[PDB]
């Protein structure tokens, strides 16, 4: 299980970020 | 303020479509659910689970259907111990030697705790796999020949303890090291111990007298039964039992007692008040 | 003080007066002397009996009430009783088998919070701080001048009484309502009333029946532009004429916007389901008899699963966006609710002066060289000049500039010529600017030709003249330049300058000059005559002492240079951007207190009266037949006089609106504008009103939405409006009426997507009763949809471009075609809503069998399952689960119901995007909606993997294979919706559209 918790925290965090890059795409 | 009409034609006057084309929908939908829930079931092998971590470090159930993990009755009222007796009657009645019959489907096994009989592979190859049985007769003064209700404890009760059946779970008891019940009959190889206490190792108001029972006169469980092979490849399967009669010189008092079980494949949760252990409040208000 | 339909209906009839009395018909009537005023003693003594002069503003319901009246907004009962039943319940559990569980008690505080928070959101909405009287009361003055016993004494304007003697001087303001007895050279800015700011004259000349028109009544609020007067005060404050308005206006229920009466309609529908269900499944709760608190714990569920939470404030926010969006096109919004309003609009009523036009008298045409020229009547000078090639111009320029008393105000070279502060009047400065602008300076051109003597305009002779030292090197010395009325400036001319060369004033031109004076002024223009003379060199040598008592120099056979003409002209956009509001199918109507001759001319100018369209009168004189002989329905357009309105009835009026397209109510009371709005309203229609003048307030404040003008307009008009065109651009009404048709669509999408996800939230709790199953989706779990994942993605539709020329469809129709309707609920609930649940259950069914409990061995468990003592329960194999053992799988079942829901909402958020276009027709250019996705999704994850969400939310980590459940179901949702839209677009009248096109 330890290997799953550090698994979702990543493809999630690379989605609050890609969202900021789609957001700051002209505002 | 009128659904109708005339100048209108009512809400639709058909309606027919507006509704008929909704059975169609809800059905075509229903089906599509049915399918995807049937193929979903292709499946998770007929014999085992797919995940089992959610039942691991199994817990210690019992045979007094706990009102609130507790038993309050008087030796007097022949109605006061009914709730406890009829329900014991419930579970033990599945055990009468009248039902355990012939080398099929069961098979007698060591009156002494034996090895780990691994019946076979969880394939359907062997049919109703065979089942080392257990006679109600390993129950210290918790059995006899009565009417429609065994002769159970009018003064100084009785509460049998059990294990949580898991699919393919092999208990591995503690080595000779640092447990609780020091090596004074610590059946090293083939039995799981169960030690009863008040409230930890700290000053508990020990107001009881601890007396046990079992298979070979052992307070624990025999590895001659596991693994369990599913209620499919093994209906009729019966699990081990381990009564602990409470003949404490005390009475008229609530005192919490915990019946832990020990082993390497035994754990506990702090919020699971029954994971790999017990917890029962007890009072025989005479 | 009777009802409102009286105290406020009497404030609606026009007034009636006593300028018709003689001077001794007063005297008695007030007791006031006149050579010398009142007693001062019978003054303050009239004060008591009649009571202080000035107005008192309506009371203010503070920032308590204004708030809380919110904490019951529709869904807010349901959301309120859910958190009360919570505070019940818990109690119950603080009495039975020890359950010091955080559980429900939190749901009580939680829910309660949301009900509050939800209110603000819908409060920073129904806002409306309308300081109107703290604008009118600012137009009375500090002191006033009255006389008593004979002494003249200024005093606190409020110590004026119904009776004494007031001397208004020049520039200052008019204390009460005056009947003028003495009076001098007294003109007066009647703008607050007429709407125009050109001064009218005050004499004791009773002249006229109507007290608004006689020159012997002075008016509260107005100011004396020049001169002096004396008056007896006939009305004192609240009781006056303007005051009787500030009353009637600061007395007007804003009332339902057209939007907020949509919210207060889907709410009525929702809440409906939210009970019908909620009590269907509760008498039936305890008709199979779950506990007591096994039903009141199941209400708290069914409620919450029903009240959409993250919507009624999702919508508050959709507004606040497109609002703060127009404010960049320089249109300010003072009332959020209003950001919609402009769009739903089917009629506009516009003040002409200052709103439709620039309220700047200005040169529209000319008559140089026998040809008619036209100049640039814009504010910026878009269009073209007209010429100067000809000498004749150098000459006419000279006159028009030379014979003129207008300067510019100090310190103004900064601003554009036109927007510069004059020190003249109507024409004079309108001419000054014409020149300066397109003929070099005039501070200069008036030292070249220095004036030696002049004759200012006298009413008798209708002319004005200066003799100037022309300074040429040759050089007749002595240029006489005069302007004046035209028809009466030929009887003083015998020659007509042409391209440079004088000629005889024959008959060709005399007819063609009168032939142009008609054409020209038929455009509702003030037209002037300009003429000059080079004074015979001999007859006046260098020194001549011209006299202006005894005339002395010639006044005939002067040369005739040309005609010049002015007007109050549209602003640039106004005309192009009025015909716009008709590709939109909006009706425009002129509502102006100006005079009918200008009105109808300006009307036709901006375009409220279209080419080739006529009125009755227009017709009679196109068939020389008396008027009462014309079939009035032959007439599309018509001009109506405020003096016939006076005696009309709502019904003759409902007929004047019901039967004409191009309307112009001219010269109109303030009341009268309202009297019209009210009757446009009368029959359903949503109406806007444009204004700038205190004369407007009332309509600008009965308006469904009221638009003021930014810099023209008056503290008032605006402080009584919803929008406020900060740059006075009258095109932001088209911009705004579009941006507001889109917030409508994009509010349906924004709602649908919210409501759709509501169905796979109710059905869990619904089956929990049906197949005594283990509760798939938990309460605290639901306040994660519309408060968590769903917020952002919904907010995001509000940013959605259109799907066609919206401003090419008739305006929506308040009564039919609502925001939320049959065809929509049939979709978020009846359709896409179900499919969302079939996918939400499907995985609960997988979480449990992949974990043992093969579906069917579920159809009962709850009764036992939920038991905290029955630690020994058979699955579908034999395995015996404890409590926390199996629950940790129940919550594990929430945790990814809560996902298959978020996973389906992808497919949702992408088809609540468009309502007709395939997603390949409209594409995914919404660089924000996409963000909502990435957020939504990842939020969930985080809500499921952080060390904590489990112990805090019953949210437990999931296993890879787990997330992809709903997938086929998202993708179904997706493909179903796409095929809908197709159908429609292939059969646009066909059954599907009737049934799915919201
Ligand atoms: C599946 C169970 C638990 C839910 C029962 C609710 C069903 C029967 C309800 C919920 C939504 C309902 C629909 C809601 C709105 C539409 C549109 C209107 O033009 C006619 C009624 C109609 C067509 C309703 C028919 C019945 C309906 C489908
Ligand atoms: Mg105006
Ligand atoms: Rb909800
Ligand atoms: Rb308003
Ligand atoms: Rb929802």
PDB file of C-alpha atoms in Angstrom, chain C residues 443-656:
ATOM      1  CA  UNK C 443      -8.222  84.378 -29.828  1.00  0.00           C
ATOM      2  CA  UNK C 444      -6.092  85.545 -32.745  1.00  0.00           C
ATOM      3  CA  UNK C 445      -8.557  86.192 -35.599  1.00  0.00           C
ATOM      4  CA  UNK C 446      -9.958  88.876 -33.377  1.00  0.00           C
ATOM      5  CA  UNK C 447      -7.081  91.243 -33.089  1.00  0.00           C
ATOM      6  CA  UNK C 448      -6.357  91.127 -36.741  1.00  0.00           C
ATOM      7  CA  UNK C 449      -9.766  92.623 -37.271  1.00  0.00           C
ATOM      8  CA  UNK C 450     -10.167  94.748 -34.179  1.00  0.00           C
ATOM      9  CA  UNK C 451     -13.726  95.756 -33.328  1.00  0.00           C
ATOM     10  CA  UNK C 452     -14.330  99.541 -33.122  1.00  0.00           C
ATOM     11  CA  UNK C 453     -18.022  99.425 -32.371  1.00  0.00           C
ATOM     12  CA  UNK C 454     -20.828  96.905 -31.980  1.00  0.00           C
ATOM     13  CA  UNK C 455     -24.551  96.436 -31.640  1.00  0.00           C
ATOM     14  CA  UNK C 456     -25.540  93.443 -29.506  1.00  0.00           C
ATOM     15  CA  UNK C 457     -28.568  91.339 -30.390  1.00  0.00           C
ATOM     16  CA  UNK C 458     -31.848  93.199 -29.731  1.00  0.00           C
ATOM     17  CA  UNK C 459     -35.170  91.406 -29.826  1.00  0.00           C
ATOM     18  CA  UNK C 460     -36.762  94.172 -31.865  1.00  0.00           C
ATOM     19  CA  UNK C 461     -34.384  94.028 -34.860  1.00  0.00           C
ATOM     20  CA  UNK C 462     -33.381  90.325 -34.710  1.00  0.00           C
ATOM     21  CA  UNK C 463     -29.874  91.224 -35.935  1.00  0.00           C
ATOM     22  CA  UNK C 464     -26.359  91.626 -34.477  1.00  0.00           C
ATOM     23  CA  UNK C 465     -23.391  93.585 -35.876  1.00  0.00           C
ATOM     24  CA  UNK C 466     -19.812  94.781 -35.470  1.00  0.00           C
ATOM     25  CA  UNK C 467     -17.688  97.160 -37.488  1.00  0.00           C
ATOM     26  CA  UNK C 468     -14.032  96.112 -37.499  1.00  0.00           C
ATOM     27  CA  UNK C 469     -10.801  97.556 -38.886  1.00  0.00           C
ATOM     28  CA  UNK C 470     -10.001  95.219 -41.734  1.00  0.00           C
ATOM     29  CA  UNK C 471      -6.221  95.568 -41.833  1.00  0.00           C
ATOM     30  CA  UNK C 472      -5.469  94.537 -45.345  1.00  0.00           C
ATOM     31  CA  UNK C 473      -2.677  96.230 -47.210  1.00  0.00           C
ATOM     32  CA  UNK C 474      -5.688  97.276 -49.363  1.00  0.00           C
ATOM     33  CA  UNK C 475      -7.675  97.688 -47.116  1.00  0.00           C
ATOM     34  CA  UNK C 476     -11.013  99.386 -47.279  1.00  0.00           C
ATOM     35  CA  UNK C 477     -10.606  99.704 -43.489  1.00  0.00           C
ATOM     36  CA  UNK C 478     -14.002  99.144 -41.934  1.00  0.00           C
ATOM     37  CA  UNK C 479     -15.602  95.757 -42.293  1.00  0.00           C
ATOM     38  CA  UNK C 480     -19.192  95.596 -41.176  1.00  0.00           C
ATOM     39  CA  UNK C 481     -20.244  92.083 -40.330  1.00  0.00           C
ATOM     40  CA  UNK C 482     -23.706  91.115 -39.149  1.00  0.00           C
ATOM     41  CA  UNK C 483     -25.694  87.943 -38.531  1.00  0.00           C
ATOM     42  CA  UNK C 484     -29.247  87.363 -37.483  1.00  0.00           C
ATOM     43  CA  UNK C 485     -32.495  85.734 -38.416  1.00  0.00           C
ATOM     44  CA  UNK C 486     -32.222  84.801 -42.106  1.00  0.00           C
ATOM     45  CA  UNK C 487     -35.540  85.517 -43.814  1.00  0.00           C
ATOM     46  CA  UNK C 488     -35.091  88.883 -42.139  1.00  0.00           C
ATOM     47  CA  UNK C 489     -31.499  89.366 -43.229  1.00  0.00           C
ATOM     48  CA  UNK C 490     -32.229  89.683 -46.943  1.00  0.00           C
ATOM     49  CA  UNK C 491     -34.411  92.753 -46.442  1.00  0.00           C
ATOM     50  CA  UNK C 492     -30.968  94.070 -45.576  1.00  0.00           C
ATOM     51  CA  UNK C 493     -29.042  92.536 -48.461  1.00  0.00           C
ATOM     52  CA  UNK C 494     -28.717  93.292 -52.121  1.00  0.00           C
ATOM     53  CA  UNK C 495     -25.786  91.100 -53.097  1.00  0.00           C
ATOM     54  CA  UNK C 496     -24.597  87.523 -52.681  1.00  0.00           C
ATOM     55  CA  UNK C 497     -20.889  86.703 -52.535  1.00  0.00           C
ATOM     56  CA  UNK C 498     -19.916  83.708 -54.804  1.00  0.00           C
ATOM     57  CA  UNK C 499     -16.551  81.872 -54.843  1.00  0.00           C
ATOM     58  CA  UNK C 500     -15.161  85.310 -54.253  1.00  0.00           C
ATOM     59  CA  UNK C 501     -17.111  87.703 -56.407  1.00  0.00           C
ATOM     60  CA  UNK C 502     -20.128  89.772 -55.357  1.00  0.00           C
ATOM     61  CA  UNK C 503     -23.200  89.660 -57.549  1.00  0.00           C
ATOM     62  CA  UNK C 504     -26.782  90.925 -57.627  1.00  0.00           C
ATOM     63  CA  UNK C 505     -29.319  89.377 -55.239  1.00  0.00           C
ATOM     64  CA  UNK C 506     -31.544  88.479 -58.170  1.00  0.00           C
ATOM     65  CA  UNK C 507     -34.590  86.244 -58.152  1.00  0.00           C
ATOM     66  CA  UNK C 508     -32.783  83.016 -59.027  1.00  0.00           C
ATOM     67  CA  UNK C 509     -31.059  82.975 -55.673  1.00  0.00           C
ATOM     68  CA  UNK C 510     -33.788  84.619 -53.608  1.00  0.00           C
ATOM     69  CA  UNK C 511     -36.034  81.662 -54.446  1.00  0.00           C
ATOM     70  CA  UNK C 512     -33.242  79.112 -54.038  1.00  0.00           C
ATOM     71  CA  UNK C 513     -32.116  80.629 -50.716  1.00  0.00           C
ATOM     72  CA  UNK C 514     -35.672  80.304 -49.394  1.00  0.00           C
ATOM     73  CA  UNK C 515     -35.410  76.972 -51.182  1.00  0.00           C
ATOM     74  CA  UNK C 516     -32.635  76.021 -48.805  1.00  0.00           C
ATOM     75  CA  UNK C 517     -33.833  77.709 -45.607  1.00  0.00           C
ATOM     76  CA  UNK C 518     -36.735  75.262 -45.784  1.00  0.00           C
ATOM     77  CA  UNK C 519     -34.777  72.135 -46.647  1.00  0.00           C
ATOM     78  CA  UNK C 520     -32.197  72.987 -44.002  1.00  0.00           C
ATOM     79  CA  UNK C 521     -34.487  73.742 -41.041  1.00  0.00           C
ATOM     80  CA  UNK C 522     -36.805  70.927 -42.004  1.00  0.00           C
ATOM     81  CA  UNK C 523     -34.038  68.991 -40.296  1.00  0.00           C
ATOM     82  CA  UNK C 524     -34.968  70.624 -37.022  1.00  0.00           C
ATOM     83  CA  UNK C 525     -32.020  72.979 -37.101  1.00  0.00           C
ATOM     84  CA  UNK C 526     -31.602  76.513 -35.844  1.00  0.00           C
ATOM     85  CA  UNK C 527     -30.596  78.406 -38.994  1.00  0.00           C
ATOM     86  CA  UNK C 528     -28.777  81.768 -39.039  1.00  0.00           C
ATOM     87  CA  UNK C 529     -28.081  84.446 -41.626  1.00  0.00           C
ATOM     88  CA  UNK C 530     -24.617  85.905 -42.146  1.00  0.00           C
ATOM     89  CA  UNK C 531     -23.828  89.078 -44.092  1.00  0.00           C
ATOM     90  CA  UNK C 532     -21.203  91.804 -44.395  1.00  0.00           C
ATOM     91  CA  UNK C 533     -20.271  95.122 -46.032  1.00  0.00           C
ATOM     92  CA  UNK C 534     -17.004  96.686 -47.000  1.00  0.00           C
ATOM     93  CA  UNK C 535     -17.780 100.189 -45.998  1.00  0.00           C
ATOM     94  CA  UNK C 536     -17.217 102.598 -48.922  1.00  0.00           C
ATOM     95  CA  UNK C 537     -13.720 103.963 -48.565  1.00  0.00           C
ATOM     96  CA  UNK C 538     -14.525 107.635 -49.187  1.00  0.00           C
ATOM     97  CA  UNK C 539     -17.706 107.935 -47.123  1.00  0.00           C
ATOM     98  CA  UNK C 540     -15.744 106.910 -43.988  1.00  0.00           C
ATOM     99  CA  UNK C 541     -12.108 107.764 -43.741  1.00  0.00           C
ATOM    100  CA  UNK C 542      -9.512 106.740 -41.210  1.00  0.00           C
ATOM    101  CA  UNK C 543     -10.992 108.164 -38.041  1.00  0.00           C
ATOM    102  CA  UNK C 544     -14.710 107.985 -38.613  1.00  0.00           C
ATOM    103  CA  UNK C 545     -16.751 108.207 -35.439  1.00  0.00           C
ATOM    104  CA  UNK C 546     -19.382 105.543 -35.901  1.00  0.00           C
ATOM    105  CA  UNK C 547     -22.266 106.038 -33.551  1.00  0.00           C
ATOM    106  CA  UNK C 548     -24.718 103.458 -32.261  1.00  0.00           C
ATOM    107  CA  UNK C 549     -27.383 105.729 -30.777  1.00  0.00           C
ATOM    108  CA  UNK C 550     -28.103 107.833 -33.801  1.00  0.00           C
ATOM    109  CA  UNK C 551     -27.442 105.291 -36.478  1.00  0.00           C
ATOM    110  CA  UNK C 552     -24.677 106.514 -38.690  1.00  0.00           C
ATOM    111  CA  UNK C 553     -23.527 103.881 -41.171  1.00  0.00           C
ATOM    112  CA  UNK C 554     -25.319 101.840 -43.883  1.00  0.00           C
ATOM    113  CA  UNK C 555     -27.531  98.878 -43.145  1.00  0.00           C
ATOM    114  CA  UNK C 556     -28.646  97.927 -46.595  1.00  0.00           C
ATOM    115  CA  UNK C 557     -27.367  96.413 -49.759  1.00  0.00           C
ATOM    116  CA  UNK C 558     -24.967  94.620 -47.461  1.00  0.00           C
ATOM    117  CA  UNK C 559     -23.412  91.555 -49.051  1.00  0.00           C
ATOM    118  CA  UNK C 560     -24.901  88.130 -48.254  1.00  0.00           C
ATOM    119  CA  UNK C 561     -22.191  85.586 -47.373  1.00  0.00           C
ATOM    120  CA  UNK C 562     -24.215  82.501 -46.396  1.00  0.00           C
ATOM    121  CA  UNK C 563     -26.450  80.461 -44.062  1.00  0.00           C
ATOM    122  CA  UNK C 564     -25.133  78.418 -41.079  1.00  0.00           C
ATOM    123  CA  UNK C 565     -27.161  75.889 -39.081  1.00  0.00           C
ATOM    124  CA  UNK C 566     -26.865  74.034 -35.794  1.00  0.00           C
ATOM    125  CA  UNK C 567     -28.499  71.143 -33.974  1.00  0.00           C
ATOM    126  CA  UNK C 568     -28.215  68.801 -31.009  1.00  0.00           C
ATOM    127  CA  UNK C 569     -26.807  65.773 -32.889  1.00  0.00           C
ATOM    128  CA  UNK C 570     -26.600  62.084 -32.219  1.00  0.00           C
ATOM    129  CA  UNK C 571     -23.395  60.771 -30.737  1.00  0.00           C
ATOM    130  CA  UNK C 572     -21.373  58.725 -33.218  1.00  0.00           C
ATOM    131  CA  UNK C 573     -22.383  55.230 -32.354  1.00  0.00           C
ATOM    132  CA  UNK C 574     -25.975  56.011 -31.603  1.00  0.00           C
ATOM    133  CA  UNK C 575     -27.381  55.519 -35.081  1.00  0.00           C
ATOM    134  CA  UNK C 576     -25.407  52.465 -36.199  1.00  0.00           C
ATOM    135  CA  UNK C 577     -25.947  51.044 -32.727  1.00  0.00           C
ATOM    136  CA  UNK C 578     -29.730  51.508 -32.568  1.00  0.00           C
ATOM    137  CA  UNK C 579     -30.467  49.571 -35.707  1.00  0.00           C
ATOM    138  CA  UNK C 580     -28.348  46.984 -33.991  1.00  0.00           C
ATOM    139  CA  UNK C 581     -30.937  46.571 -31.262  1.00  0.00           C
ATOM    140  CA  UNK C 582     -33.335  45.545 -34.005  1.00  0.00           C
ATOM    141  CA  UNK C 583     -31.324  42.805 -35.649  1.00  0.00           C
ATOM    142  CA  UNK C 584     -31.907  41.833 -32.054  1.00  0.00           C
ATOM    143  CA  UNK C 585     -35.649  42.446 -32.326  1.00  0.00           C
ATOM    144  CA  UNK C 586     -35.772  44.958 -29.517  1.00  0.00           C
ATOM    145  CA  UNK C 587     -38.249  47.868 -29.777  1.00  0.00           C
ATOM    146  CA  UNK C 588     -36.803  51.393 -29.387  1.00  0.00           C
ATOM    147  CA  UNK C 589     -38.870  54.287 -28.203  1.00  0.00           C
ATOM    148  CA  UNK C 590     -37.975  57.972 -27.731  1.00  0.00           C
ATOM    149  CA  UNK C 591     -39.057  59.406 -24.368  1.00  0.00           C
ATOM    150  CA  UNK C 592     -38.067  63.101 -24.234  1.00  0.00           C
ATOM    151  CA  UNK C 593     -39.256  66.308 -22.637  1.00  0.00           C
ATOM    152  CA  UNK C 594     -38.012  68.261 -25.643  1.00  0.00           C
ATOM    153  CA  UNK C 595     -40.254  69.610 -28.413  1.00  0.00           C
ATOM    154  CA  UNK C 596     -41.889  67.421 -31.068  1.00  0.00           C
ATOM    155  CA  UNK C 597     -40.236  69.109 -34.036  1.00  0.00           C
ATOM    156  CA  UNK C 598     -36.723  68.301 -32.943  1.00  0.00           C
ATOM    157  CA  UNK C 599     -37.767  64.945 -31.501  1.00  0.00           C
ATOM    158  CA  UNK C 600     -39.177  63.484 -34.727  1.00  0.00           C
ATOM    159  CA  UNK C 601     -36.218  64.862 -36.641  1.00  0.00           C
ATOM    160  CA  UNK C 602     -33.625  63.380 -34.312  1.00  0.00           C
ATOM    161  CA  UNK C 603     -35.767  60.271 -34.098  1.00  0.00           C
ATOM    162  CA  UNK C 604     -35.444  59.732 -37.867  1.00  0.00           C
ATOM    163  CA  UNK C 605     -31.789  60.627 -37.439  1.00  0.00           C
ATOM    164  CA  UNK C 606     -30.578  57.894 -35.108  1.00  0.00           C
ATOM    165  CA  UNK C 607     -33.121  55.569 -36.690  1.00  0.00           C
ATOM    166  CA  UNK C 608     -36.059  55.158 -34.429  1.00  0.00           C
ATOM    167  CA  UNK C 609     -38.164  56.249 -37.422  1.00  0.00           C
ATOM    168  CA  UNK C 610     -37.013  54.323 -40.479  1.00  0.00           C
ATOM    169  CA  UNK C 611     -36.807  55.412 -44.094  1.00  0.00           C
ATOM    170  CA  UNK C 612     -40.043  55.610 -46.040  1.00  0.00           C
ATOM    171  CA  UNK C 613     -42.041  55.208 -42.862  1.00  0.00           C
ATOM    172  CA  UNK C 614     -44.744  57.757 -42.089  1.00  0.00           C
ATOM    173  CA  UNK C 615     -47.143  59.057 -39.476  1.00  0.00           C
ATOM    174  CA  UNK C 616     -50.719  60.254 -39.817  1.00  0.00           C
ATOM    175  CA  UNK C 617     -49.841  63.882 -40.007  1.00  0.00           C
ATOM    176  CA  UNK C 618     -46.956  63.023 -42.330  1.00  0.00           C
ATOM    177  CA  UNK C 619     -49.685  61.546 -44.520  1.00  0.00           C
ATOM    178  CA  UNK C 620     -52.438  64.158 -44.428  1.00  0.00           C
ATOM    179  CA  UNK C 621     -49.915  66.610 -45.861  1.00  0.00           C
ATOM    180  CA  UNK C 622     -48.994  64.082 -48.513  1.00  0.00           C
ATOM    181  CA  UNK C 623     -52.648  64.013 -49.593  1.00  0.00           C
ATOM    182  CA  UNK C 624     -53.865  67.476 -48.576  1.00  0.00           C
ATOM    183  CA  UNK C 625     -56.696  65.937 -46.538  1.00  0.00           C
ATOM    184  CA  UNK C 626     -57.717  66.940 -43.016  1.00  0.00           C
ATOM    185  CA  UNK C 627     -56.153  64.622 -40.433  1.00  0.00           C
ATOM    186  CA  UNK C 628     -59.184  63.145 -38.700  1.00  0.00           C
ATOM    187  CA  UNK C 629     -59.683  61.618 -42.121  1.00  0.00           C
ATOM    188  CA  UNK C 630     -56.623  59.347 -42.110  1.00  0.00           C
ATOM    189  CA  UNK C 631     -56.974  55.663 -41.210  1.00  0.00           C
ATOM    190  CA  UNK C 632     -54.601  55.674 -38.191  1.00  0.00           C
ATOM    191  CA  UNK C 633     -53.541  52.068 -38.807  1.00  0.00           C
ATOM    192  CA  UNK C 634     -52.008  53.195 -42.113  1.00  0.00           C
ATOM    193  CA  UNK C 635     -49.360  54.801 -39.917  1.00  0.00           C
ATOM    194  CA  UNK C 636     -46.435  52.730 -38.688  1.00  0.00           C
ATOM    195  CA  UNK C 637     -44.712  55.534 -36.730  1.00  0.00           C
ATOM    196  CA  UNK C 638     -46.078  58.330 -34.558  1.00  0.00           C
ATOM    197  CA  UNK C 639     -45.145  61.266 -32.378  1.00  0.00           C
ATOM    198  CA  UNK C 640     -47.225  61.817 -29.289  1.00  0.00           C
ATOM    199  CA  UNK C 641     -47.390  64.979 -27.290  1.00  0.00           C
ATOM    200  CA  UNK C 642     -47.065  64.988 -23.556  1.00  0.00           C
ATOM    201  CA  UNK C 643     -50.122  67.222 -23.546  1.00  0.00           C
ATOM    202  CA  UNK C 644     -52.299  64.532 -24.999  1.00  0.00           C
ATOM    203  CA  UNK C 645     -50.744  61.940 -22.688  1.00  0.00           C
ATOM    204  CA  UNK C 646     -52.010  64.156 -19.897  1.00  0.00           C
ATOM    205  CA  UNK C 647     -55.573  63.268 -20.909  1.00  0.00           C
ATOM    206  CA  UNK C 648     -55.092  59.784 -22.271  1.00  0.00           C
ATOM    207  CA  UNK C 649     -55.986  56.570 -20.552  1.00  0.00           C
ATOM    208  CA  UNK C 650     -53.733  53.575 -20.038  1.00  0.00           C
ATOM    209  CA  UNK C 651     -55.967  51.845 -22.562  1.00  0.00           C
ATOM    210  CA  UNK C 652     -55.800  54.367 -25.401  1.00  0.00           C
ATOM    211  CA  UNK C 653     -52.099  54.064 -24.602  1.00  0.00           C
ATOM    212  CA  UNK C 654     -51.845  50.250 -24.551  1.00  0.00           C
ATOM    213  CA  UNK C 655     -53.372  50.736 -27.997  1.00  0.00           C
ATOM    214  CA  UNK C 656     -50.757  53.329 -29.062  1.00  0.00           C
TER     215      UNK C 656
END
